[PDB]
Amino acid sequence: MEFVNKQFNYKDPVNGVDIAYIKIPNAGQMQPVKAFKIHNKIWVIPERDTFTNPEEGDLNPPPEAKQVPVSYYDSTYLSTDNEKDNYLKGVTKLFERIYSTDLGRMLLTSIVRGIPFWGGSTIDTELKVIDTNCINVIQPDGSYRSEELNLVIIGPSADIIQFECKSFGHEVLNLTRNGYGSTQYIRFSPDFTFGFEESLEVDTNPLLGAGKFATDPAVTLAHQLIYAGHRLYGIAINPNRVFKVNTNAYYEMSGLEVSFEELRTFGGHDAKFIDSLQENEFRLYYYNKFKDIASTLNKAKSIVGTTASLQYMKNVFKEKYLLSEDTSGKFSVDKLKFDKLYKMLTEIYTEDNFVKFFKVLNRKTYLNFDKAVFKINIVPKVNYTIYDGFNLRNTNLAANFNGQNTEINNMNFTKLKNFTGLFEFYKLLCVDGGSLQCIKVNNWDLFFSPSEDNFTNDLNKGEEITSDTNIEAAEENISLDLIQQYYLTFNFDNEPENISIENLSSDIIGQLELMPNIERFPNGKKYELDKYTMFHYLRAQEFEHSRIALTNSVNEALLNPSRVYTFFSSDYVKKVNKATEAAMFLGWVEQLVYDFTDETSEVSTTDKIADITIIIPYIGPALNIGNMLYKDDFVGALIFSGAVILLEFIPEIAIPVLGTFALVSYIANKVLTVQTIDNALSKRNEKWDEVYKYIVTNWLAKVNTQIDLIRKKMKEALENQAEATKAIINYQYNQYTEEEKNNINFNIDDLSSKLNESINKAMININKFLNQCSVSYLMNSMIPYGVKRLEDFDASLKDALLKYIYDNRGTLIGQVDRLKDKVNNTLSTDIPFQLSKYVDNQRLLST
């Protein structure tokens, strides 16, 4: 123990201090629930949540199917003392795991300091607690006392693997969006986790194992705490701000509900989907909310419902909001300290950064959707530790995230049935009109495609440059060094003491926050197409797990369920389809492993594209890129038109005529005229940086996302090939009569392992290629439209400033040539584009 300085057993008796039956805010009445206080301001309740929502009482699968990639239902889970005990030890262990990291130590500390604001009075000269931020703690003698708290962890409602962060609302105030904060209830379970597919970590790991991987539940809990942090500090982005997707095209998703907050909280490339304009909008919005809080602290003449003094309570909120105070005692919001605190909560505390600290395998995007659900047990030390998670040191599970590999570490992951059917939410893609060849494509296997309305700019808007024009210091890049800098400003003692309040009504009446009405997206929309598609080519490579598979080179594999499509050569099919005599089986399998490697490790080298040095030719026939077909045709297609060929949809990238600067002059004041010129020149630098950041934003959301899904499909295609080949080989083995056992002695697992190495080796090359395309399209097809407008702008500012200096040669006299040289040198050179200035992540940065 360390963060949880207590080693609870569920059955331990009640004491009314850290083990007690409690009453939480509720729509009407609830019977007390036995709860545990694991740490100051933080409680845990080992019950399924049938309390927080009056609508969520039943624990069964709902009548309406629910449009999520993964879900799980079992009304029996968490109803025994034994399960409750294990939940309590599970949640505890995850807290300790989060606390062992520098990042987690800060976040948990931030959480404890983030006391919800005392803004419950209708009289604005008083500080009063808001009741729904408290709970009632039953005593052994039957009586109760009320207590403030910041965080409650409760078991999930009906859908066992829907982890979410809920809190109670107010009649007039928006507590999670006004700076105040409110006590957060996290529905969470440490007894289940998600299965997902990797594609992005093989470069740093050639030896990565075969199938699905398991999310470390410490990441899942951290993510939720990050949400909780935002709402505790009342700076959460309105849930009405969401990423709207286009849905009408055949390759697009039928729908997706991602919020700004969800993407902000993940971090990584996803956070950069949110354009600067809205980012400045949100920061400025919460700045003002903090300002209002300071005012209210200055208005306060009294405090009700506690024995703590006004002075102590004013000090608590000064400490939370990092307010400064005069010697007279006036509280204020310093713009510098705010920006630091808001960045810490907003951009330092992200899911992507925790993964850096946990050293686990994890999704690199929110758009990498969960695929499976697993039963887990993280309590035994031999399963999962505070220090390594599943990947225990000095064990087979230490390297290549093996302990997270669902196949190698099968003792630890039991697959459960996904209650969301594979083709429950889908589009129907058909090719030829009386006869049709139709395939269902899972909603979440389709393309992202954000709508144009999510991206805004004021690049067209003009400006006046004065000697008083604000120059903003360049944004300090989010990195492990910045996090280190913030870690050193923490002082890990002096958490706000558990002050006693007067008792509330024994039933705390509260409603959860609105949660906006969101209509189900349409389902099973049919599409009639003339040409096969990426999805068709992919489906053709699958077979049924009547048993004898055969490989072939055309999509009529979509016709026979016993023929499977391969993008491998005609030579390879002859060999793998060839019926093989027993005395020659081993030599056959060995040669097939070499052939498989030769087919998958193909790399064409070029100097004809620029920003693209390698080309993997088989991506052409593997996913039907451009439709044209043929490997040597694909290299030719790529060389002719560049990276665009890979995209399913071409983004629009319209940069308007950039707003020009009008300069103000100051007759006979040399110094202020000098400042106007400098402020104009540094404002051009800002303008360049702004167009670059805007283009990058667009590129990440509309382009790089397409490539991200294209590597997933490439890993699928490869996996499909290895399965077809294995099936074929195993069928061949199974035809021999007992000349198998003593003589052949064939290990299908060693084969499966060899093929997995090839797939790994191939994906290294595929990642290199797809990154190059991605960056290439940015550099050649998007950035040039930015630079063009910026060039026109420099020429305008050049003329303005050389005229301005001439018209003020009377005022400037001392140094007109100096300033004339400064303008000529600054504006005759483009500000060069550095990608590391605009992405914090490391992939696509090597390139």
CSV table of N, CA and C in Angstrom, one decimal, residues 303-356:
chain,number,residue,atom,x,y,z
A,303,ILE,N,-19.9,32.5,5.9
A,303,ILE,CA,-19.9,31.1,5.5
A,303,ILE,C,-20.9,30.3,6.4
A,304,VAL,N,-21.8,29.5,5.7
A,304,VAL,CA,-22.8,28.7,6.5
A,304,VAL,C,-22.5,27.2,6.4
A,305,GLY,N,-23.0,26.5,7.4
A,305,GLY,CA,-23.0,25.1,7.4
A,305,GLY,C,-21.7,24.4,7.7
A,306,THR,N,-20.9,25.0,8.4
A,306,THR,CA,-19.6,24.4,8.8
A,306,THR,C,-18.9,25.2,10.0
A,307,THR,N,-18.0,24.6,10.7
A,307,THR,CA,-17.2,25.4,11.7
A,307,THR,C,-15.9,25.9,11.2
A,308,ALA,N,-15.5,25.4,10.0
A,308,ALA,CA,-14.4,26.0,9.3
A,308,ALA,C,-14.7,27.5,9.0
A,309,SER,N,-13.6,28.3,9.1
A,309,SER,CA,-13.8,29.8,8.9
A,309,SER,C,-13.9,30.2,7.5
A,310,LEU,N,-14.4,31.4,7.2
A,310,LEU,CA,-14.4,32.0,5.9
A,310,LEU,C,-13.0,32.0,5.3
A,311,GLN,N,-12.1,32.4,6.1
A,311,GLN,CA,-10.7,32.5,5.7
A,311,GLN,C,-10.1,31.2,5.3
A,312,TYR,N,-10.4,30.1,6.0
A,312,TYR,CA,-10.0,28.7,5.6
A,312,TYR,C,-10.6,28.3,4.3
A,313,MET,N,-11.9,28.5,4.1
A,313,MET,CA,-12.6,28.1,2.9
A,313,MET,C,-12.2,29.0,1.6
A,314,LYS,N,-11.9,30.2,1.9
A,314,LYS,CA,-11.4,31.1,0.8
A,314,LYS,C,-10.0,30.6,0.4
A,315,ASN,N,-9.2,30.1,1.4
A,315,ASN,CA,-7.9,29.6,1.1
A,315,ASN,C,-7.9,28.3,0.3
A,316,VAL,N,-8.9,27.5,0.6
A,316,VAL,CA,-9.0,26.2,-0.1
A,316,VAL,C,-9.2,26.4,-1.6
A,317,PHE,N,-10.0,27.4,-2.0
A,317,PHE,CA,-10.3,27.6,-3.4
A,317,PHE,C,-9.2,28.4,-4.1
A,318,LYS,N,-8.5,29.2,-3.3
A,318,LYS,CA,-7.3,29.9,-3.8
A,318,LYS,C,-6.3,28.8,-4.2
A,319,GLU,N,-6.1,27.8,-3.4
A,319,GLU,CA,-5.2,26.7,-3.6
A,319,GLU,C,-5.6,25.9,-4.8
A,320,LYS,N,-6.9,25.6,-4.9
A,320,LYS,CA,-7.4,24.8,-6.1
A,320,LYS,C,-7.3,25.5,-7.4
A,321,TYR,N,-7.8,26.7,-7.5
A,321,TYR,CA,-7.8,27.5,-8.7
A,321,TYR,C,-6.5,28.3,-9.0
A,322,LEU,N,-5.5,28.1,-8.1
A,322,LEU,CA,-4.2,28.9,-8.2
A,322,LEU,C,-4.4,30.4,-8.3
A,323,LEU,N,-5.3,30.9,-7.5
A,323,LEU,CA,-5.5,32.3,-7.5
A,323,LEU,C,-4.4,33.1,-6.7
A,324,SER,N,-4.1,34.3,-7.1
A,324,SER,CA,-3.2,35.1,-6.3
A,324,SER,C,-3.9,36.1,-5.5
A,325,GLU,N,-3.3,36.5,-4.4
A,325,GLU,CA,-3.9,37.5,-3.5
A,325,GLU,C,-3.0,38.7,-3.1
A,326,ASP,N,-3.6,39.9,-3.2
A,326,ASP,CA,-3.0,41.1,-2.7
A,326,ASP,C,-2.7,41.0,-1.2
A,327,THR,N,-1.9,41.9,-0.7
A,327,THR,CA,-1.7,42.1,0.7
A,327,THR,C,-3.0,42.6,1.4
A,328,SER,N,-3.9,43.2,0.6
A,328,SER,CA,-5.2,43.6,1.1
A,328,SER,C,-6.2,42.4,1.2
A,329,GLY,N,-5.9,41.3,0.5
A,329,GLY,CA,-6.7,40.1,0.5
A,329,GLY,C,-7.6,39.9,-0.7
A,330,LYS,N,-7.4,40.6,-1.7
A,330,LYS,CA,-8.2,40.5,-2.9
A,330,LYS,C,-7.6,39.4,-3.8
A,331,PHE,N,-8.5,38.4,-4.1
A,331,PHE,CA,-8.2,37.3,-5.0
A,331,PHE,C,-8.3,37.7,-6.5
A,332,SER,N,-7.4,37.1,-7.3
A,332,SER,CA,-7.5,37.5,-8.7
A,332,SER,C,-6.9,36.3,-9.5
A,333,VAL,N,-7.3,36.2,-10.8
A,333,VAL,CA,-6.7,35.2,-11.7
A,333,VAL,C,-5.6,35.8,-12.6
A,334,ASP,N,-4.4,35.3,-12.3
A,334,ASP,CA,-3.3,35.7,-13.1
A,334,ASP,C,-3.3,34.8,-14.4
A,335,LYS,N,-3.3,35.5,-15.6
A,335,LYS,CA,-3.4,34.8,-16.9
A,335,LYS,C,-2.3,33.7,-17.1
A,336,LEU,N,-1.1,33.9,-16.5
A,336,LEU,CA,0.0,33.0,-16.7
A,336,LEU,C,-0.3,31.7,-16.0
A,337,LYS,N,-0.6,31.8,-14.7
A,337,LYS,CA,-0.9,30.6,-13.9
A,337,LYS,C,-2.1,29.8,-14.3
A,338,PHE,N,-3.1,30.5,-14.8
A,338,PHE,CA,-4.3,29.9,-15.4
A,338,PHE,C,-3.9,29.0,-16.6
A,339,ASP,N,-3.2,29.6,-17.6
A,339,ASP,CA,-2.8,28.9,-18.8
A,339,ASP,C,-2.0,27.6,-18.5
A,340,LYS,N,-1.1,27.7,-17.5
A,340,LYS,CA,-0.3,26.5,-17.1
A,340,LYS,C,-1.2,25.4,-16.5
A,341,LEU,N,-2.2,25.8,-15.6
A,341,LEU,CA,-3.1,24.9,-15.0
A,341,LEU,C,-4.1,24.3,-15.9
A,342,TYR,N,-4.5,25.0,-16.9
A,342,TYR,CA,-5.5,24.6,-17.9
A,342,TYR,C,-4.8,23.6,-18.9
A,343,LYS,N,-3.5,23.9,-19.2
A,343,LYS,CA,-2.8,23.0,-20.1
A,343,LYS,C,-2.5,21.7,-19.4
A,344,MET,N,-2.2,21.8,-18.1
A,344,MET,CA,-1.9,20.6,-17.3
A,344,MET,C,-3.1,19.7,-17.4
A,345,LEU,N,-4.2,20.2,-17.1
A,345,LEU,CA,-5.5,19.4,-17.0
A,345,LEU,C,-5.9,19.0,-18.3
A,346,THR,N,-5.6,19.7,-19.3
A,346,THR,CA,-6.1,19.6,-20.7
A,346,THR,C,-5.3,18.7,-21.6
A,347,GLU,N,-3.9,19.0,-21.6
A,347,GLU,CA,-3.0,18.4,-22.5
A,347,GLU,C,-1.9,17.6,-21.9
A,348,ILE,N,-1.6,17.8,-20.6
A,348,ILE,CA,-0.6,16.9,-19.9
A,348,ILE,C,-1.3,15.6,-19.5
A,349,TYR,N,-2.4,15.7,-18.8
A,349,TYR,CA,-3.2,14.6,-18.4
A,349,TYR,C,-4.0,14.1,-19.6
A,350,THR,N,-3.4,13.2,-20.4
A,350,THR,CA,-4.1,12.5,-21.5
A,350,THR,C,-3.8,11.0,-21.5
A,351,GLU,N,-4.7,10.3,-22.1
A,351,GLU,CA,-4.6,8.8,-22.2
A,351,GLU,C,-3.2,8.5,-22.8
A,352,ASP,N,-2.9,9.2,-23.9
A,352,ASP,CA,-1.7,8.9,-24.7
A,352,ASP,C,-0.4,9.1,-23.9
A,353,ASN,N,-0.4,10.0,-22.9
A,353,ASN,CA,0.7,10.3,-22.1
A,353,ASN,C,0.9,9.2,-21.0
A,354,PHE,N,-0.2,8.6,-20.5
A,354,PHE,CA,-0.2,7.6,-19.5
A,354,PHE,C,0.5,6.4,-20.0
A,355,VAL,N,0.2,6.1,-21.3
A,355,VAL,CA,0.8,4.9,-22.0
A,355,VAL,C,2.3,5.0,-22.1
A,356,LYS,N,2.7,6.3,-22.3
A,356,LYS,CA,4.2,6.6,-22.3
A,356,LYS,C,4.8,6.2,-20.9
